[PDB]
Write a protein that binds this DNA or RNA. Sequence first.
RNA 1: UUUUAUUCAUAUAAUUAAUAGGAUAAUAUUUGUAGUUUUUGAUACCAUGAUAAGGAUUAUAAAUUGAAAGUGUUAAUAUCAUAAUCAAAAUUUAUUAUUUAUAUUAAAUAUGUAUGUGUAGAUAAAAUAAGA
Lengths: 157, 356, 99, 239, 132
Amino acid sequence: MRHIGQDVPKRHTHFVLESRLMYEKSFRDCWLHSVCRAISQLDEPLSKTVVGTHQKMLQRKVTCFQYNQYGLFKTPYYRLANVDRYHAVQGVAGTREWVPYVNVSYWTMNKMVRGGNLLVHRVHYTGWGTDSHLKKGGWEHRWNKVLQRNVLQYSRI
Amino acid sequence: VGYTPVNPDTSPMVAYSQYHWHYNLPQGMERPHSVNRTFAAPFQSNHSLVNKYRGVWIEFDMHPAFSVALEPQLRKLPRGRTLPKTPAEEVIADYTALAPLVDDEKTRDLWLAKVFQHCAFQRCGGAMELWERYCHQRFTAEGATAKPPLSLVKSVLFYCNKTDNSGWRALFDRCLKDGWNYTPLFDTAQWSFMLKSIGRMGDEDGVRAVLEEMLDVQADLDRVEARSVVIALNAVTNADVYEFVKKYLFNFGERKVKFLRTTYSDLRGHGAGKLRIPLKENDNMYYHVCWHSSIRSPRQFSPRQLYFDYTPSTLGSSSHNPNAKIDDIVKDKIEKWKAEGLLPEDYVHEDRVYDR
Amino acid sequence: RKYPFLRRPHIKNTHSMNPSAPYFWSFMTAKSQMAFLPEENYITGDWTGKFFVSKRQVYTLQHATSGAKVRVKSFPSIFEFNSPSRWNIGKEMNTLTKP
Amino acid sequence: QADRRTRHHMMVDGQINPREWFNWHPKEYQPWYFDRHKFLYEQRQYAQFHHLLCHQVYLKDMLHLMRYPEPYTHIIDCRTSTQKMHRWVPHSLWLPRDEVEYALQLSADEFLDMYGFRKPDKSDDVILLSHNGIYSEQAGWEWKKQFFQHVYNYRGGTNELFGESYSDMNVSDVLSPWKGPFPQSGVFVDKWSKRKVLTRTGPFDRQYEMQDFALPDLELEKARHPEEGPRQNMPFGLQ
Amino acid sequence: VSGVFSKGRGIGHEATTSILRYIPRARVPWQPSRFGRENLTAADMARLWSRGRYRDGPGNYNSGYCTERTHVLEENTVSIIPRRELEKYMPDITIGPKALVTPVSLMNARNGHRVTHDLLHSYDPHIGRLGK
RNA sequence: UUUUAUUCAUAUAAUUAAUAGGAUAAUAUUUGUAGUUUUUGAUACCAUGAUAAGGAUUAUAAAUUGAAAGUGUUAAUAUCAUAAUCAAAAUUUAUUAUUUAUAUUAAAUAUGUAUGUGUAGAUAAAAUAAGA
């Protein structure tokens, strides 16, 4: 149990496995927590049907239920620790320490690129790359283009 | 390199190495694999079927006019997949009162079969009175050859199975190939209930006879209930029967026997609660079922567990430890020459070196 | 070493300075004073005893009226809020530590 | 607390340790069944003769043939040692197993004038009967090697057909315990790291595993083992 | 001997183990002796389960359910404030077990879940199984 | 007798072994699959790879808008293939390139102390869509 049989060179690699549980619990409890927070914090009348003291009591009951929810995952995602699944190296998202698409640390990504383990295409180290969105505005412009492709193209009936 | 093995699927090195396909090639299909059409497999789900009838069917094919006529009475009797709560004695009285009025053998037999089925479902104690009242005078008094339809036989067998009655044997004997020949028409659930009832009866002879009849009539040996099979095989105290079961286990499938072992173990352990009647203690058959399942399952390889006490060769033992094997090998050679003709007989051989 | 804005990996590096009189409410507290108190002020289930109240709990009148001992975690092993007062009402415990 | 038989030594007594999982070729871990109860010539050790196995003939088939003989179905008796032969199988001609090799080489007339009956052709089906099916099975192997089409073997034999206890081969199924070191013919080395390992041969044999196994009888096994338990010289976690 | 656990108990029934011992069992070649979570005693299992959820569950001393009256830290032991004293200034809003479970119709919206527990309660008898 | 700049901020706390399929499928309660206990390198050691620093020189004249960034080694460091007693949640703990005078705290808790005539010594950087 305690370094008798582990079968792995790095024991910290189980932190990724237990963080997957955090993500699963977030997927479970995101809707309930969001609805409870919206109902509790909303001050204007909910609808024509319910107003005034009924709404106030409903808000207090909802926040009481939300507080009684023991184990409900309510944690900002940036507070979650990011560690690569291969070498247990920790990286901060938003810096060069972490690679978002591969979801591995900078050390692991560099090792896999120097070896034949990832299919990437080398470009100039001090440029913008092949992508036209990157060359025409940068990270924020590609961010906006991704948003436009994902959401801001549908009619949304 | 490293304790973590490389992934051969997404690694460009292995993907584009000499032993795989480079990316500067036509990238066409390597070979048109066809497995399912060359050799398909049957659908075998580990989970049981959720839409099966989970019971015994009676094939209530009553004439429509008589069904309309007896519908007020038939509402109490079970319909398709519906079991009303009407007590068995009430429908028994209704049938024994209104039977002469119907005046048609087919519908009378169908109604009596429904009554027997309802009594079996309610586990009513007294129902053989109706069978005695409407069976001897037509079917089995002494030599009557009138064959009953395949509803009364099913209902009576199911009632015997539910109530642990002893009258199942007469109809089972009369249903053989020589007589009514209704055995091929029987269902897997019918066989399972019969096996369970005879197992919780102490009738090893009956269990053996039913197993032989099923083997001859091509009954589903792998679709019968595992608990029912365990109950039937528990009562094998007789030697000849026990030997028959020993040679009979080979008919069942590997999965069937492997799960029969688990069913027997669970019933003799935690399964006493789920068993309606506690299972009678029979260690020999349980051990033989476990042994048969272990024999028929594929064998693994445990080198330490098999050769834990493997003594080394005498040569190595004499080389390493100071043992008498050095002269014992010479004595063995002398014994071999004595057994053969190379060495004269009636010649004594004493010790050669000092015993230490 | 630089890290994304308002996403410093250190969580306790925040040094709550001396409370500022002009605001005293829009600083280290809830953005709106019509919001409910956080969960730390309440009891969720049947516990066997709290070791020490967290620093995110807001201070209320019942803290000084009930008289029960309250303590938080700081640089030393523990810090108990001895001699309760009424001046610190509506403020969280992190604003009264000076780490 | 620790023993020579419980540690993970690589080689003991000047021989490769047979208890370690890494001292064995992985081909020995592959699934296999116990065929010790099927037939004498269906055993794994006779795999070199498995490609010459003949089709079976049963007692009911033999009785049917006896009641209704067929014009071109030859029933050949392979029982040698006629001192041990006492009864005549119906519609049967005697062809000794020792002379079958030369009988198939002989021509039609050379077979006729030497064995008293005409040689059955390849297209004609021939049923071979012996004491226990061993000699008849070897004869069937000879016939199939001589490319006869239908060569069936009656494995029930004279013992089943007449209630006789005669044995044609008297082969002892139980194999004598191994004496001597591991045969170097069974030593395998990996083709990359040049590490020598062991194979299931010699002292560590699948025949030895099939024998010395739990008997089908609970009373017999309980009498075989002491009252304490089946295995007690091993640790608690090794049983 | 440096044994992690001093005691252990079997799981198979006493009626079936005594007969199944005569049939050899194929153990794992690289680890024949297996000591799983079921073989632990009741007290050992309770301690291990309590320690398991140290981050979010009652595993942390200050989180609750610690059943310990004093905590030793920084070479200075500190006593525990009981629930009766705590509830004087912490108004209790406990609902009970009826709060953690959500209705069945909310399973789809909660991604196949009903209980709002610290641990994910699987509905299959193979993940959260302990012997039974 | 050539040009440019330099006040830089967190840092340790305790336990990591298994496979198990569900509606429209010719039927498996296998619904609900139940045999403790002979092993041990990193809660603290793997020494080996990358990186830092970092240079080379032929293009006559006409045409063309063209025909134009390349690294050993020495070093330090480290999370990888190699040598058992222990860092990652309870963070004070000091870790180089910062907003200077018309208007300055509203949504996850988001900085009250160095105005002083911009005044040393050392250190780094570039001939690159700029204009020595």
